[PDB]
Design a binder for this molecule. Structure first.
Ligand SMILES: *[C@@H]1O[C@H](CO)[C@@H](O[C@@H]2O[C@H](CO)[C@@H](O[C@@H]3O[C@H](CO[C@H]4O[C@H](CO)[C@@H](O)[C@H](O)[C@@H]4O[C@@H]4O[C@H](CO)[C@@H](O[C@@H]5O[C@H](CO)[C@H](O)[C@H](O)[C@H]5O)[C@H](O)[C@H]4NC(C)=O)[C@@H](O)[C@H](O[C@H]4O[C@H](CO)[C@@H](O)[C@H](O)[C@@H]4O)[C@@H]3O)[C@H](O)[C@H]2NC(C)=O)[C@H](O)[C@H]1NC(C)=O
Ligand SMILES: *[C@@H]1O[C@H](CO)[C@@H](O[C@@H]2O[C@H](CO)[C@@H](O[C@@H]3O[C@H](CO[C@H]4O[C@H](CO)[C@@H](O)[C@H](O)[C@@H]4O[C@@H]4O[C@H](CO)[C@@H](O)[C@H](O)[C@H]4NC(C)=O)[C@@H](O)[C@H](O[C@H]4O[C@H](CO)[C@@H](O)[C@H](O)[C@@H]4O)[C@@H]3O)[C@H](O)[C@H]2NC(C)=O)[C@H](O)[C@H]1NC(C)=O
Ligand code: NAG
Ligand code: FUC
Ligand code: FUC
Lengths: 196, 207
């Protein structure tokens, strides 16, 4: 069993982070080998994290990739070997489309609660690789949860991010902002603010 | 060896006494050479005998697939009974066992809030009507949209999302033509869940 994983969306969009692809493999002294190919041609800058013994009786190899390589759609072939299995992944193919970002205040009806919901609708983006964060006065907020991307009826994706705050923090007029990073956006990043 | 997959009833099915909730046990990779299999069904570990097994269906990869459907009492699912399907075959003289039930935990009532389109989205030809459903447990839920009796076609609903208090939430988005929203048409988000009175609630939204 060989499983290939893509880099984190955030890591491919900021030139300062390190986007990896993670080839996971998953007890009679099994040796394993690893060959990495980028659009067919092989590369020798992988790294094999040390063996992991599981409760059921999990070797991993990690290859750093270039930001513009992943985003241009190059195929990443991970080839195992044990005395032969392959996997390939790439970015989803297609014209990237720019997320529209809309912040939605809490319902009047929710205002009878002690905490309230601040909503960030992110729609019309493609491919589904995206990252969403919340902050206020520069410091990130922690109490938020973001739905997975959902396929919309036009072949673009959407998601919602919900930020839970004390109603008083909302009543006091604090500024909350939803951050979105996506490849189709200008400088890969956009912000939208929400206040009372 | 074969493989067994056990599917729960649909959330609308268990919530409405008029519908027919079913647990479905599907066996794939049943050998072509000797394909006789047996289903044993158990409810809370007590064998039941009213399941309905389909005839084998020959697949296009030289295997067989067999389906058994167990009709469930609505209050049996909501009361958390466990459904085991056991699949036995004389081909390998082996047995595979799967168990499914409603997720354990105290049910919690969803709060349903409807959020109008953003002002910034009003420059588009279509606007987003949002239904926020939060604080519900377990995650089994159904969400629909309608207007003036008739249902609406152009909506999508996110999967349930585990929130930080252990309950679930989701959002449903209804896309409508800006004109329809600006005419004052009333739109309703309908939510179905065991912890709601009559298993159903409805919130409206208009300009
Ligand atoms: C005994 O040992 C273990 C028991 O623990 C078993 O291992 C499990 O086997 C399962 C099947 O054999 C397998 O299920 C598949 O899951 C994958 C998805 O894997 C992710 O999700 C799992 C559950 O959520 C995790 O446990 C996995 O570890 C993995 O999670 C993490 O995902 C991260 C994403 O945030 C990612 O981290 C990022 O990696 C990038 C890489 O670029 C960057 O580094 C970045 O910085 C990171 O954030 C990681 O990859 C990963 N975490 C790690 C590596 O630490 C799923 O795709 C797959 O589905 C395939 O097949 C189905 C067919 O049904 C098909 O529908 C799909 O299309 C797809 O083709 C399976 O569902 C488990 O993942 C796996 N657990 C492991 C390996 O830890 C063994 O199998 C047992 N031995 C046996 C049975 O013999
Ligand atoms: C020979 O051909 C056979 C026929 O295709 C192959 O059978 C297939 O075998 C695979 C596994 O090898 C099964 O995969 C599982 O599917 C589950 C979901 O299946 C539902 O959805 C699929 C579409 O995605 C659909 O085709 C199925 O028929 C099934 O539909 C549901 O059916 C029930 C009952 O009828 C109904 O109530 C539902 O409404 C209906 N749903 C929908 C949407 O239509 C997955 O859940 C399984 O995942 C398990 O394993 C995963 C491991 O990664 C794990 O992540 C999961 O959590 C879970 O543990 C699994 O993916 C196929 O269903 C099966 N096909 C059929 C038609 O039964 C056979 O494999 C092949 N053999 C060879 C050697 O090639
Ligand atoms: C056949 O199945 C029975 C029931 O589990 C088991 O006791 C028996 O050992 C199996 N046959 C063989 C040859 O092991
Ligand atoms: C399929 C695997 O089964 C075992 C667990 O310990 C792992 O977390 C994984 O879910
Ligand atoms: C042989 C199999 O039969 C059934 C289908 O669901 C599969 O896709 C495949 O064609």
């Amino acid at each position: 069993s060989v499983f290939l994983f893509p880099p984190k969306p955030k890591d491919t969009l900021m030139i300062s982070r390190t986007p990896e692809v993670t080839c996971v493999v998953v007890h009679e002294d099994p040796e394993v080998k690893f060959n990495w190919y980028v659009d067919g041609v092989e590369v020798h800058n992988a790294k094999t994290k040390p063996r992991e013994e599981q409760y059921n009786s999990r070797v991993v190899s990690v290859l750093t990739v270039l930001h513009q390589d992943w985003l241009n759609g190059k195929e990443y072939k991970c080839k195992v070997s044990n005395k032969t299995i392959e996997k390939t992944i790439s970015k989803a193919k297609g014209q990237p489309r720019e997320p529209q970002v809309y912040t939605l205040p809490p319902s009047r009806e929710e205002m009878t609660k002690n905490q309230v919901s601040l909503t960030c609708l992110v729609k019309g983006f493609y491919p589904s690789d995206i990252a969403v964060e919340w902050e206020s006065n520069g410091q990130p907020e922690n109490n938020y949860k973001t739905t997975p991307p959902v396929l919309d009826s036009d072949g673009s994706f959407f998601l919602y991010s919900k930020l839970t705050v004390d109603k008083s923090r909302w009543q006091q007029g604090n500024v909350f902002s939803c951050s979105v990073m996506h490849e189709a956006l200008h400088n890969h990043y956009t912000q939208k603010s929400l206040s009372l």
